[PDB]
Each structure stands twice: as C-alpha cells, then as structure tokens.
Amino acid sequence: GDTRPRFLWQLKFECHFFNGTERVRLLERCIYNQEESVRFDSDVGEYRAVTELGRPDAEYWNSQKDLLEQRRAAVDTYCRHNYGVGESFTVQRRVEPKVTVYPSKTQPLQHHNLLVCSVSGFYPGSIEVRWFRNGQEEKAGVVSTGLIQNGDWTFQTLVMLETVPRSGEVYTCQVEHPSVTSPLTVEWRA
Amino acid sequence: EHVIIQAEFYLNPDQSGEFMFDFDGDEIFHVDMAKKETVWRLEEFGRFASFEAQGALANIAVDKANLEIMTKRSNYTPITNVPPEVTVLTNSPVELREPNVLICFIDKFTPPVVNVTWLRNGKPVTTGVSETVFLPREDHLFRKFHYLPFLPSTEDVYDCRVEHWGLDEPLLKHWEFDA
C-alpha cells in the first residue's frame, strides 16, 4: 500500500459581508497541515503569525509596503468587486421549498402520534419552520433534524412534533422563507 | 451575513492541486487543472459570470513552492490523517418508483484524498453517478459529496463505500427503502 507521509498547504481568502457591501472584512489565511500559521485580517491591517511556524512570513510580507497597500484595498477591489459580480445568482438566488406533512414510520409510544414536516429542495438556507396546534404555536415536543446542505445549492430539513391526537384538532406546519411573501402552511387534521 | 471564499491547496506527494470559490458553503466553481478551464457548479452561473482559469494555475505553482518551503521548515512534519464522517441520505422523502437521488456526505476529514464507490446489492454502480471536488471547512478539514440517481424499490439496497488513510478498513454506509 501507499504509506508515504503527506504534506498539505492551503490558502484561503475569506470575504465577509455585513449588510451587503456596507461592512466588509477580508481574511487571508495560510494553513500548513491542519494548522493555520499566518494570516491577514483587514481589521488589523497587516500580517500576523498564528504560530511560530508562520512568524518568518508575517515579518517578511509586512516589510513589503506595496503588498500591504494592495492587500489593504482588496476589501474593495476584491471582495466588494466579486460580491457585485455574483450578487444576482447567489445573494438573490431563490428556490421555494417543497413542503409535505405525514406521520412518522416509527411512532414509539402508543397514544401518541409523531408528525413529520418535510421541507426540502429550498434556497437559501435561512428558514423558519413552526408547528401550531389549533392556531397556537408549540414549543415542547418539537424536535428538528437540523439544516442539511445538499451540496447542490439546495437544502432540506425535517421537523417532528409528538402529539396526543384528539379528533377535530388541527396541527399546522408553518414555513417562512425568503422565496415567499407569505408563510406556507400544511395542516394535519386529527 | 455572507461569505465568499477563494480556497486553494496543494498536496505532496500526491501532487493534488485545487482552486475553487465558495459562497456560504456552496461551490460557485473550481478550475480543472488539466483542461485549464472554469467548471461552474451550476450551469447557469457560467452564463452570468466568467473567470480566467489561467490565473488559478499561477497561484497553484506558488502554492506548491510554498508547500516545499513549509515542509522543510517544520522538519518534514507530516499531516495527521483524520478519517471522514460518512452519511447517506436522499435529497427528498423517498416514495416507491418515484425518482430520487442518493447523497453520500463525506465530511470532517484530511488529507483531501478519498476513494468512494456506490453499491447496488453488493455490486458497484457507475451509471449516472457524479461527485464534487473537495470543499473547505472552517476547521480546515474537508467535505465532499457523491451522488447516485435511482428509482426506489423494496428490492434494491445500497451502500456508499469510502476509503481513506485514516480508516483502518473501508467504511460502508447502508441505505434501503424503509419509509
């Protein structure tokens, strides 16, 4: 087999946007194997060693006035620039979630019906899924599987609700997402 | 509220090199180091924006030179293998004979080299499968997705077989129609 040791090098330029291009932070970072060694935070304005292994570079690069000046303007020429370039298909991308409600295939405890609210194929990831019993929100018994990023610019999530079903009751799954002006609702008639 | 990351890496001695852009965890594109061209994650992206693939090849060359410098500086300290967390799911609730897609999520691992294969009833599947490149993580490990388009049935069973230096044995995540 292949047993030779591996040596890895990573370089990451992170552009952080707060309220559009209002506040922008650039973070350039170097990682040797699994360790960040040196970085450039636009908030600091210069390279800073993260570990001794990076000290030589932080010192060396900071001695290059040209680089420092160029890096300092990257927040505009790089970050804000690229943000505006892809804004239309990233920041504004929207795909409505598919919503469906059905009882769980498990159903452990007898006189209890575990309801499942499946919310899938949506974008962006920001979303609010709530459960209501007869128009009044439910806090307890609610358990989510978490937000799942499918890797294809799509998300999905399952939100359960254990209940003590009584004929006539109306359990509603409400979903709020940027893809819709008004919340989506799917009812389960007990 | 939003993060755009230009992520790149070089791995010795595999000679692996990568260059990609990330938007809130999702890949915008990466550069094919051999064909020297921009590969967009979604087709429509390439109709709204462009990227000079040639530029990534310049960065990669510097990335490797720096790897060599750093390797020597650490007195050839090798990377510690971290085995992946593997999970299998469908992209939507499964229903008999209703078109779906099996997703094999390979996460939290390093170095970025894995062997992934799909198994339909113990046999390898090659038809319709697709995969993504290595995606960055805040902790500096990687993620990766493998896909298998299928038609649910009570008869078929699947497995995502993953091999990585951090795994003493190949890991198999089973999946079968339960709902």
């Binding site: 370089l11 330029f13 350039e28 030589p56 570079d57 010192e59 060396y60 690069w61 290059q64 680089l67 990257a74 020429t77 790089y78 620039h81 690229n82 505006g84 370039v85 892809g86 | 230009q6 790149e8 852009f21 709204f48 924006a49 462009s50 990227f51 000079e52 530029g55 990534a56 310049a58 960065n59 510097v62 990335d63 030179a65 720096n66 410098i69 750093m70």
Partner: peptide
C-alpha cells in the same frame, strides 16, 4: 462580469 482572484505571494525562503 468577471471574478477577480487574489494572487498568492511567495514565502520567506
């Protein structure tokens, strides 16, 4: 519209 990338600087030899 074209994406701009950041150039990598060489390390201290």
């Amino acid at each position: 519209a074209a994406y701009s990338d950041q150039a990598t600087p060489l390390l201290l030899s």
